[PDB]
Symmetry: C3
């Protein structure tokens, strides 16, 4: 099916945690960028208007671009970069299927690492595997690493001597992430995307992690474990059978990724909450938490195929 989407690139303020804000060059003014959810084989057109003062592109990471290399989105290799004020059109077939993503390919050490120029590109297989068909809830987790010294210095950063100090899932750090809420008998798919500069070791308590897909491609047999080491650019789809009611941590097991600046108990961390046990526990950090749906695109993935903006991810224009 033919599908046509429009994206703008806007100077945008976001807040990672507390008072830690950041200047971003955000697609449709949100970080992560809009979800693009299409069927394997769809013919996609994207029109990208640059409303910032710096050049950009969009590269579609995981798209083979068969016969369409001039839409690969690499400045000085497949196109002239999109200059401020200009519009560029990308045209490609959505293939192969799987957890893909898209990001700017200009000055990546700054733009992708710390300017939020990334979003998920989910391509549905025409014929999903049996394991895919057991999934009841589908989550996207984009992992990023930020250097706060460059928070309000657009056009700069991503250089030797940088001190990484904030770590996010979908551009929020714990305790401002959202819980993953389930019931016994659910099967969840965690689509982990290595959007950052660091390796992350994603560990889930109380459950068997079934690493079932790498870079969109199904593994011969899922690998069982409890910690998934994921590097920059990689994607892993982890399937978890929700057979064990409780309150359960999901976090980066690299301990320096669980801090917010110099404070512990932050960074890349959330929880799985089963409705069977409830959250009314005197010790529980999130007993009084106001839940925000769609923080992992888990509701938007249930909508009709297309591009989905998010009020959850929208920042403030600069």
């Amino acid at each position: 099916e033919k599908r046509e989407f429009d994206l703008s690139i806007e100077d945008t303020r976001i807040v990672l945690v507390g008072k830690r804000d950041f200047h971003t060059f955000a697609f449709n003014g949100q970080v992560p960028a809009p979800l693009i959810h299409v069927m394997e084989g769809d013919d996609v057109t994207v029109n990208v208007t640059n409303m910032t003062t710096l050049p950009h592109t969009i590269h579609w990471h995981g798209m083979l671009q068969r016969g369409t290399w001039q839409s690969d989105g690499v400045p000085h290799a497949t196109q002239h970069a999109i200059e401020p004020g200009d519009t560029f059109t990308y045209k490609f077939k959505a293939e192969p299927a799987g957890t893909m993503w898209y990001h700017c390919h200009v000055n990546v050490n700054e733009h992708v690492t710390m300017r939020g120029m990334w979003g998920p590109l989910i391509v549905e297989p025409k014929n999903p595997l049996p394991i895919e068909k057991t999934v009841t809830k589908d989550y996207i987790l984009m992992l990023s690493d930020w250097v706060s010294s460059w928070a309000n210095k657009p056009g700069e950063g991503g250089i030797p001597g940088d001190v990484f100090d904030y770590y996010t899932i979908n551009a929020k750090s714990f305790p401002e992430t959202q819980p993953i809420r389930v019931k016994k008998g659910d099967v969840i798919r965690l689509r982990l995307i290595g959007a950052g500069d660091h390796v992350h070791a994603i560990h889930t308590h109380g459950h068997i992690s079934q690493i079932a897909f790498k870079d969109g491609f199904p593994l011969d047999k899922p690998i069982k474990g409890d910690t998934v080491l994921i590097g920059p650019g990689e994607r892993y789809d982890v399937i978890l059978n929700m057979d064990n009611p409780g309150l359960w941590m999901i976090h980066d097991h690299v301990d320096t990724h669980t801090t917010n600046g110099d404070k512990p108990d932050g960074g890349i961390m959330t929880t799985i909450e089963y409705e069977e046990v409830g959250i009314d526990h005197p010790f529980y950090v999130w007993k009084d938490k106001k839940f925000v749906p769609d923080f992992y695109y888990e509701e938007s993935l249930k909508k009709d195929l297309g591009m989905h903006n998010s009020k959850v991810f929208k920042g403030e224009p600069i």
Copy 2:
């Protein structure tokens, strides 16, 4: 079977190498903590008494905690932290089988990374696989990374700007590690545990590394190679057929992990010594080494199931 153990948490001084000491919050005053060696399906009870001045927990990494989530050991999620002077009891079934471990889950960027709050939990399968039955000697290697600027500053550390400078197997750096002593025909199992903040690349000379288990679970077929990339929280069991008499290095292949402070020839490094070739070689660093048995818990793993303390790992009370 029902098994009941006691642990204290004590302020403890350990020495990594030479004159490099560290302040630790040690389980039973030792680092690594006591070996817990039990059968799959055993009902384990652990009474934990906090004799330090900071709060702690024990998380049982790899234990599914089926129906026992309140024993998962996460402060502000599954319990209130164990306050100084108090005793908390963990109750869980030992499952699944494999190389597991335990560690504090309070302020992990400090407590786990640099206060030695970790030990091995070995759960024997009721029906071991054929490859496991070939094993003649079993070794536990826990890999850690230390920041010496915080050595004597308990309650501080694990923050942006930290400079890692010491690297250990079971809390010692080379040359104060111990040789792995074998004879031709032996089959050894190295249980590698990523207790640290960094990825380690464990390389063994003269032999084929058979990567046979990840996070306790058997891989469909062992992966053959010579270098095992292991990240924080992961465990890998590597089986080696001892068919090649000589003196053989095993070391982290990340070169910055083989230094003691700014001196070369240290960190995560030991040798494999075959009795056939002997150690009487003029060039050999360890020709006159005082051998310490049980440095990899290789002697304790042969004893009756239960908890094993060791004077080898015991520090000095602070």
Copy 3:
């Protein structure tokens, strides 16, 4: 067959990119060291003459050294280091087959990390697998990370505090690497060698990466993806079917590995060029590039088995 090679170790100046030179201890005055290309089972002799003022060895990484441990090349373990002015002879069988390499084993934090003391050791199998027989072009990419502050301070470096700032394929950074030139129907084998201190995440646009070998050993089935996480010491052979004409980036997806000093658009990066689409494009960085053959040993690997020096990699004597 019996094969005998000579290597000198010489103080040598190389240039990574632009004006960024480095003092190296180079085998035959080149970095990477000469290609050794032999058949599985060949009996190799290497006479190594030290013409520098520091001690060195050569370790043959991936060589089992069955019965030949005293040729393993580890100082203080299998030999006395080779002193200045001295000659040491290594004798071993070339086994097993695969992408192996060789490097000094003295003060590796300096000598291997930043003194260029490494080269490829390709051992051809007697009976290649069906996937190996589909390969039309064979490339060697040795990945390194450098600390420029020690560039001209031989005998120093590789210590806590170091700031890594240059990243290379075969001792050159983009834009001074060379394009990989193919035609439709080609099948290329990228032999990736983790010669550096860092993990690298090698990402190829427009093609499916088939990760087919680890540490020289064939994987049960190739793993499909687009990004290969490769750690220090590891080797991965990636097979790519060239079925998609275009100009395509290959680069390290850790974004801080794509900078030269504090400048973007450098580091571990090159392109694949299909002859069908040409290079005459106004936006293309390398439209006017002077192509230098054998930058990936792609020509030398086609020559008769033996040792191959390279003018491309030759530095200047110091």
